From a paper:
The second variation is its long linker (51 amino acids) between the β7 and β8 strands. The three consecutive cysteines (C199, C200 and C202) before the β1 strands form three disulfide bonds with C336 and C340 from the β6-β7 loop, and C415 after the β8 strand at the C-terminal region, respectively. None of these disulfide bonds is located within the core of the β-sandwich domain. They are all at the bottom of the FS domain and are associated with N- and C-termini, especially the N-terminus, where they seem to help define and stabilize the globular FS domain. There is one N-linked glycosylation site (N214) at the end of the β1 strand in the FS domain. The common pentasaccharide core of the linked glycans is visible in the electron densities. All three aspartic acids are from the two highly conserved and characteristic FS domain "repeats", P322SPDW and D354AGTD (in F-spondin). The homology of its core structure to a common Ca2+- and lipid-binding C2 domain suggests that the F-spondin FS domain may be responsible for part of the membrane targeting of F-spondin in its regulation of axon development.
F-spondin is an extracellular matrix (ECM) protein with multiple domains, including an N-terminal domain (reelin_N domain), an F-spondin (FS) domain and six thrombospondin type 1 repeats (TSRs). The reelin_N domain and the F-spondin domain (FS domain) comprise a proteolytic fragment that interacts with the cell membrane and guides the projection of commissural axons to floor plate.
Author numbering: 192 to 427
Amino acid sequence: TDKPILDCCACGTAKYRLTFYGNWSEKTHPKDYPRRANHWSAIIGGSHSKNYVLWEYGGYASEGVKQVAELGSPVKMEEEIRQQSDEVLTVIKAKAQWPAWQPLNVRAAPSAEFSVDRTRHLMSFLTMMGPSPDWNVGLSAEDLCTKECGWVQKVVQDLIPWDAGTDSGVTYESPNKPTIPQEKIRPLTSLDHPQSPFYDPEGGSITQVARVVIERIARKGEQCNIVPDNVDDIVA
Ligand SMILES: *[C@@H]1O[C@H](CO)[C@@H](O[C@@H]2O[C@H](CO)[C@@H](O[C@@H]3O[C@H](CO)[C@@H](O)[C@H](O)[C@@H]3O)[C@H](O)[C@H]2NC(C)=O)[C@H](O)[C@H]1NC(C)=O
Ligand SMILES: [Ca+2]
């Protein structure tokens, strides 16, 4: 058996800003909106290698993912991430948001910086939509390395909630109801359950609840991109 070939051919390191924009408010998602309790939990994630999976669709929630989903607590997730030692480059953290939605002139969108290198060229994170039985948003294994042996300049992604598979409640404020055995992580849909706040008998996509912006802010070290990248962001 040979070691698998390297998937990322970019050189040196790159630094990114992750900014998280909530779009989940009583105005955009009126049905049973939790007017008093609504929040986003702290953001937790990391830049990492292919050898570590924080969460993935069709995967089972780790203990740390479960505690984010149910408690809004990033503490066990952060322990799990740090236990991966060299498979993780940067630990990503940003603060909780109470209430969940404000205009940008009122409150800055939470952000964090992270680094990538040839081996830790992926990024994952999650945050809990609260209150909820077990509903998060996030990205899993977003790749910052390009085929051209460079580093992506900007990624913009709109998000819908996903279900961590650990609690069977049907709406934001449902009583605790352990899902046993735990089920696979899956996205929410507009036909999950008639009491779901996202239910629409006509089906169709769920209105996005957040947008994430990932922007490159620096590169370091000799570069080996096969197309020009003359952005003046290489630090000496
Ligand atoms: C979810 O929240 C995000 C963050 O506020 C929203 O993104 C922002 O949306 C507006 C579009 O109305 C963007 O401003 C506009 O940009 C275009 C540039 O092409 C310009 O022509 C307009 O005059 C205006 O300046 C803004 O760039 C964008 N912010 C981002 C991406 O960070 C998003 O629309 C929200 N979605 C919903 C459905 O509420
Ligand atoms: Ca669930």
